[PDB]
């Protein structure tokens, strides 16, 4: 049984920070679950151009609002709590957070990092 | 790209109900991600005794408080928002929600039919 908590994780090197986002890795490849599990913050007013060549991702919006754009079609979908999007086709997409957006993210294969 | 909505799903047959909990299936086996993805309410006052022989489950607590007990040792861990537990050893465990607890759950392999529903309380 593994038990961790966000507060403690954000005080370690399993919390990664970058330009436009921060991600707290609750689980990584080493934990052996066969997926990684992340709590990722997307910063208000960012333009996050994303594309996961090497993973499938699922994202559940926990807090905040914005939009995600599917570049295959240009369709824009609203993001609000309870919206779930899955990048099943290694989709190129663009997230524009209006407020900060808090997400729970699942990656397969696991981020191993 | 798949885009779903928790609030719409809660109104459908994909919101699975048992004594002690109501679990929304957001991602299904057939979505081909290699895991299933759920939002589950565990009801205040419950005692949920669970053990998955054939699935690894990770759980992030989104709202509410209670405890989880690891029955290998009897250790009791606090559940509150931000706590993540992973059942990496097919652990036998007991969740006791103080208030309603809301979770985001991941199963590997994906949940399908009825095996983890029955293994849950």
How would the blueprint of this fold be written?
Two copies of one chain form a homodimer.
Chain A: E1 2-5, H1 6-9, E2 15-17, E3 21-27, E4 36-42, E5 48-51, E6 56-63, E7 66-70, E8 76-79, E9 83-87, E10 92-97, E11 101-108
Antiparallel strand pairs in A: 2-3, 3-4, 4-11, 5-10, 6-9, 6-11, 7-8, 7-10
Interface with most residues? A-B, 38 and 37 residues
What's the total number of strands of chain A?
11
Fraction of helical residues of chain A: under 10%
Architecture of chain A, CATH level 2? Sandwich
Radius of gyration of chain A: 14 Å
CATH superfamily of chain A: Jelly Rolls
Largest β-sheet summary of chain A: 6 strands, antiparallel
Catalytic activity (chain A): (2S)-4-acetamido-2-aminobutanoate = L-ectoine + H2O
GO molecular function (chain A): ectoine synthase activity
Function (chain A): Catalyzes the circularization of gamma-N-acetyl-alpha,gamma-diaminobutyric acid (ADABA) to ectoine (1,4,5,6-tetrahydro-2-methyl-4-pyrimidine carboxylic acid), which is an excellent osmoprotectant.
Protein name (chain A): L-ectoine synthase
């Amino acid at each position: 049984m593994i038990v961790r908590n966000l507060g403690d994780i954000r005080k370690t090197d399993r919390n990664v920070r970058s330009d436009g986002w921060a991600s707290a890795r609750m689980l990584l490849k080493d934990d052996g679950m066969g997926f990684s599990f992340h709590v990722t913050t997307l910063f208000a007013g960012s333009e996050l151009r994303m594309h996961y060549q090497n993973h499938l991702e699922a994202v559940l919006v926990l807090k905040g609002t914005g939009t995600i754009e599917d570049l295959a079609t240009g369709e824009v979908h609203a993001l609000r709590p309870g919206v779930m999007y899955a990048l099943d086709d290694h989709d190129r997409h663009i997230v524009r957070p209006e407020t900060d957006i808090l997400t729970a993210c699942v990656f397969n294969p696991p981020v191993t990092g």
